[PDB]
Paper text:
As a proof of concept, we enhanced the stability of a marginally stable designed protein (called dF106) through conventional directed evolution. dF106 was created in an effort to computationally redesign the ubiquitous Rossmann fold of thioredoxins using Rosetta Design. Using the CPOP system, dF106 variants were selected, genetically resulting in a protein variant dF106-L11P-D83V, henceforth termed enhanced dF106 (edF106). This had a high stability with a folding energy of −48 kJ/mol. Crystal structures of stabilized variants showed small perturbations in helices 1 and 2, which rendered them closer in structure to the redesign template.
As two substitutions (E54Y and K79H) appeared to destabilize edF106 and the optimal substitution appeared not to have been chosen at all positions, we prepared an enhanced version of MM9, termed [name], in which the best possible substitutions at each position, according to the measurements of single variants, were chosen: M51K, E54V, L55V, T57I, V83L, L87F, I88T, and P92S. The similar construct of [name], however, readily formed crystals in several conditions, with the best dataset collected at 2.25 Å resolution. This revealed an equivalent structure to MM9 with all Cα RMSDs at 0.70 Å, whereas when the structure was compared with dF106, the RMSD was measured to 1.83 Å. Thus, an all-Cα comparison of [name] showed an RMSD of 0.97 Å to spinach thioredoxin instead of 1.83 Å when compared with dF106.
Numbering used by the authors: 2 to 105
């Protein structure tokens, strides 16, 4: 689990050979903290089968702008360069494993 830079977008994410789950957050949010723990847990559970990253849209707004992501927290699923699925609102750890498995 770690932040990603616009710089590191393509290499770390778009080039990643594993499926990628990215959390777009603003900062100093409570709901974002809760989603961030959910995602931490999913990353460790699926450690070495997917890759999981964070986008602090305060610092890398170009990434959200690129993917037309207007709400935080947002969880995005990227596989082989393309955006495969997006989850907003209330994020269900149960649903994220459902998808993580869908693309695995």
């Amino acid at each position: 689990v770690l932040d990603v830079t616009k710089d590191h977008w393509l290499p770390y994410v778009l080039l990643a050979q594993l499926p990628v789950m990215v959390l777009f957050r603003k900062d100093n949010d409570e709901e974002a903290k809760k989603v961030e723990y959910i995602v931490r847990e999913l990353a460790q559970e699926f450690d070495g089968l997917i890759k999981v990253f964070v986008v602090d849209i305060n610092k890398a707004p170009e990434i959200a702008k690129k993917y037309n992501i207007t709400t935080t927290p947002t969880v995005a699923f990227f596989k082989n360069g393309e955006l495969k699925s997006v989850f907003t609102g209330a994020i269900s750890k149960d649903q994220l494993r459902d998808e993580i498995l869908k693309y695995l």
